[PDB]
UniProtKB/Swiss-Prot annotation:
Protein name as catalogued: Eukaryotic translation initiation factor 4 gamma 2
Family the UniProt entry places it in: Belongs to the eukaryotic initiation factor 4G family.
Residues of the full protein shown: 66 to 311 of 907
Record note on modification: Phosphorylation; hyperphosphorylated during mitosis.
Subunit structure: Interacts with the serine/threonine protein kinases MKNK1 and MKNK2. Binds EIF4A and EIF3. Interacts with MIF4GD. Interacts with DAZAP2.
Domain MIF4G: 13-232
Cystine residue pairs: none
Note, other: This gene has been shown to be extensively edited in the liver of APOBEC1 transgenic animal model. Its aberrant editing could contribute to the potent oncogenesis induced by overexpression of APOBEC1. The aberrant edited sequence, called NAT1, is likely to be a fundamental translational repressor.
Modified residues (Phosphothreonine): T24
Tissue specificity: Ubiquitously expressed in all adult tissues examined, with high levels in skeletal muscle and heart. Also expressed in fetal brain, lung, liver and kidney.
Amino acid sequence: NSANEKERHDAIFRKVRGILNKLTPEKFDKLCLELLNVGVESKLILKGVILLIVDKALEEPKYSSLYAQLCLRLAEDAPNFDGGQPGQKQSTTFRRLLISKLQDEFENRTRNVDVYDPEEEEQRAIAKIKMLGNIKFIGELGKLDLIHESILHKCIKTLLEKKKRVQLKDMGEDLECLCQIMRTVGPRLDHERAKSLMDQYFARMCSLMLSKELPARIRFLLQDTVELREHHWVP
């Protein structure tokens, strides 16, 4: 294309970043409409929009919920650019690239944590916080059927895994995140084919809720989650 066409694309991306910056529960409705007006033009523009959204989500995980809703709107309204049958769950360009991108962030954020596996200690603690933010955003997307079962199980597996370095006394926020995910996605993941895997997860959970190394709040949070499953997740 031309140099001006490249400039036009770059100005749109700078605009998308601004919109994401001032995104709030109160402004959502309006800014969401603006984003839809300029961020669905083509495949190329969709790729950048997704890159920026995930960028912001990991910077402010507190708003995962908000950004997840933004992805839902785009998934439903953005036009398809790939080349389905009636009654089949919708499949589009946006949906496909979103799934792909989160798989990418998950791999990079994982590598940042095991980079050491002094000053380096402060670095690891920051990467450990990024990984949790990443997992929380994934949970929120799964809730709206924007990502699949495979990556969710991958999140659960890393949260329950016991590293040699880390000590049982330092897994509070890791275990707290797990209970969050479990209450958010647990019911949809726990179907017949998955009985074996899930049974395995909750056994591991029961043998930790009585640990003297974990705070009171943590082991009470595990007990409440376990009890919910024993009740077939029925309210």
